Design an enzyme around this catalytic site. Structure first.
Site, PDB file in Angstrom:
ATOM      1  N   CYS A   1     -41.590  86.935  44.431  1.00 31.04           N
ATOM      2  CA  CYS A   1     -39.998  87.302  43.131  1.00 31.04           C
ATOM      3  C   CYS A   1     -40.330  85.858  43.031  1.00 31.04           C
ATOM      4  CB  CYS A   1     -38.733  87.739  44.222  1.00 31.04           C
ATOM      5  SG  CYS A   1     -38.711  86.522  45.881  1.00 31.04           S
ATOM      6  N   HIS A   2     -41.036  84.762  42.822  1.00 30.78           N
ATOM      7  CA  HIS A   2     -40.925  83.267  42.015  1.00 30.78           C
ATOM      8  C   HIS A   2     -41.351  84.003  40.714  1.00 30.78           C
ATOM      9  CE1 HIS A   2     -44.496  83.839  44.464  1.00 30.78           C
ATOM     10  NE2 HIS A   2     -45.471  83.036  43.130  1.00 30.78           N
TER      11      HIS A   2
END
Length: 169
Positions: free
Chosen positions: A141-142
């Protein structure tokens, strides 16, 4: 069960915590042990509210090291999918996490808007799923950013930047 281990990446120190029972239930990371423990507790509270049974007794395991290998690029994200239990993850969230893991490669990013368009959903639904991801690092998700900036990250902006830097972004 819970496994906690510290790793060095040059002059930085990264602490990784893995909640597991058979398969992985949750992962947290931070630059200091106190912050790591607060994130582990926040994650356990969230999973417990979704009906997941969690035990935080500390036990030895190779999970923290496997997560570190994904972080430094020795193991690709998609190969870690089989270790995840998906307990406390909705069918929608799972769909988003799997697509992201299999299609957004290390060294690249995608905006909230483009990810939403790819899955026929809304940027707000994708944002909600990213906030709730119980598997940071492995479910990348980064790599989901804003069209005009770094975007939000549930575990800290500096942590998001560190992960992007490590991946060559």
């Amino acid at each position: 069960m819970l496994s906690v281990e510290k790793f060095r990446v040059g002059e930085r120190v990264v602490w990784i915590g893995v909640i597991f029972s058979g398969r992985v239930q949750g992962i947290a990371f931070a630059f200091d042990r106190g912050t790591l423990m607060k994130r582990i507790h926040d994650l356990a509270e969230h999973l417990g509210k979704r009906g997941v049974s969690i035990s935080l007794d500390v036990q030895p395991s190779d999970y923290p090291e496997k997560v570190f290998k994904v972080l430094i690029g020795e193991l690709d994200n998609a190969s870690f999918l089989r270790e995840l239990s998906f307990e406390g993850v909705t069918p929608f969230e799972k769909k988003v996490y799997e697509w992201l893991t299999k299609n957004v490669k290390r060294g690249s990013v995608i905006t909230y808007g483009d990810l939403a368009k790819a899955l026929n959903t809304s940027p707000r639904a994708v944002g909600g799923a990213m906030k709730r991801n119980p598997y940071p690092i492995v479910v990348p998700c980064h790599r989901v950013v804003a069209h005009d900036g770094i975007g939000y990250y549930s575990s800290g902006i500096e942590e998001k930047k560190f992960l992007l830097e490590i991946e060559g972004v």
